[PDB]
Amino acid sequence: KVFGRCELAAAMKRHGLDNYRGYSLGNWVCAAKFESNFNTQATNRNTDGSTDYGILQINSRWWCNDGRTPGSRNLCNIPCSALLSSDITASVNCAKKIVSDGNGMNAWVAWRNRCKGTDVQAWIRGCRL
Numbered sequence: 001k002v003f004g005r006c007e008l009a010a011a012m013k014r015h016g017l018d019n020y021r022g023y024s025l026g027n028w029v030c031a032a033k034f035e036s037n038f039n040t041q042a043t044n045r046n047t048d049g050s051t052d053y054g055i056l057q058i059n060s061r062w063w064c065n066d067g068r069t070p071g072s073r074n075l076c077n078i079p080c081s082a083l084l085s086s087d088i089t090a091s092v093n094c095a096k097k098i099v100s101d102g103n104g105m106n107a108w109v110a111w112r113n114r115c116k117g118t119d120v121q122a123w124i125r126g127c128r129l
Helices: 006-013 025-036 079-086 089-100 109-114 121-123
Strands: 043-045 050-052
Touching: 006 043, 006 050, 006 079, 006 121, 025 121, 079 089
Parallel strands: none
Antiparallel strands: 043 050
16 A cells, blocks of 8 residues: 555554654654655565565564564564555554664664654645644
């Protein structure tokens, strides 16, 4: 599924990501845009042999199981394929565990380099409220 911007904003708010661990909805929409371009099915392999899955590119090295990442963890206790569903519940339940891990949204490379410090509320502009 390719989410529209306000359609994803709606989804993430409903799952409780707005201000989760102090991060506004704009932060989370911004990260999804540069991580997956709002595509639930996005996948791409990392250099160390792990892979990133879904709308928020959740890593197979620590958070989900894809059966092909040596040494790994599955801390969200989930198949990595469940992070590619059109229903984002599982990606949000897993992102809540990742932002809470200690470094906040810095866990998302792309958020740190392309979103952190910017006008992230621009990403929910005009979205129905």
